[PDB]
Amino acid sequence: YPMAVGLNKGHKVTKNVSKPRHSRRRGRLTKHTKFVRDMIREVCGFAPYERRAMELLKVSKDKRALKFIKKRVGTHIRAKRKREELSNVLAAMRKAA
C-alpha cells in the first residue's frame, strides 16, 4: 500500500549490495602506520599542553582536565578523543609497571 509521506516512504526499489568505494576506506590505522606513529612518540615525546593535561588527569580531576583540552585543541569532539588517549598513556605508564 505504498505511500509518499510517512515512516515507510518512497518508491519501493531493491538494494544493490556491493563492496564499497575504495576512497571511503581512507583513515584506517593500517598496522604498519600504527608502528610508525608509535615508534615516533618515544623518540620525540609529548607537547607542553598535554604534559600539563596528564598532570591534572592523574590527580586533580577529569572535568577540569577536559575543559583544558576544550580550549587548546578546538572542538568538544576532538577534546574527548584526546583525553581518552592521554588516559591510556597514563594507564600504560602506571598500570603496566
Binding site: 505511500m3 509521506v5 510517512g6 515512516l7 526499489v13 538494494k15 556491493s18
Partner: protein
Amino acid sequence: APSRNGMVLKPHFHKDWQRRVATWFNQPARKIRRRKARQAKARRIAPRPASGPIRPIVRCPTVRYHTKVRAGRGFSLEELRVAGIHKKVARTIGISVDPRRRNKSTESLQANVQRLKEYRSKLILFPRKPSAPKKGDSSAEELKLATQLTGPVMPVRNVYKKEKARVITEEEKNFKAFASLRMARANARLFGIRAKRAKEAAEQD
C-alpha cells in the same frame, strides 16, 4: 513619486549598467558558426556517429523530477563490469564511462546493462588490416547508412505502462484512504517521542 493604485517596484538600475550590457547581434552569426563546428566535425571523424558517445538511462533527482528519465554522463564501472567490457577499452568502443556514479538500485542497474549489451550487438567495428578478432565479414553490408543523429538509441524514451482495466473490489473501495495519509503522517512525527516515553516506563521498575 508614487501615484494612484500601481505596483511598488525595485528596478535594479542603481548601478552603472550601460557598461555591462550584452547585445546579441552576433547571435545569428554564431548559430551559423557552430553549425559549421558540427558539420566539419562530423565529416572530420569517420562513419563514427555524430553527437558523441552513448549515454545511460538516468533518473532525475529532486521529487519534482524523479518520475522521468534523462541521459546521463557515463555508464560507470558496475554496469561495465556486468556487461563484460573493460573500463578503459570502453571509450574507444564509443561508450562513455563515469566512474564517480554509484548504483544503489538493481532495477536501474539492469536497465543500463540491458542498454549496453543492446548497443554492442548493433555496433560494427573496423579492424585495421582485416584480421578481425571478435568481428566477422564485410561490414554489415556497408552498414546501411553512414552517420547517426542526436543520440544513438534515442536516449530519453520516457515510457509509461498500460495497466488496462480492473474491477473495483472490496478491501480496495473500503480502506486505502485520506486517513491512511494523515495517520502515517502523524506516526512519522510522533515516532521519536513515543519511543522516549517507552524508555521512561522501562526505567520505572
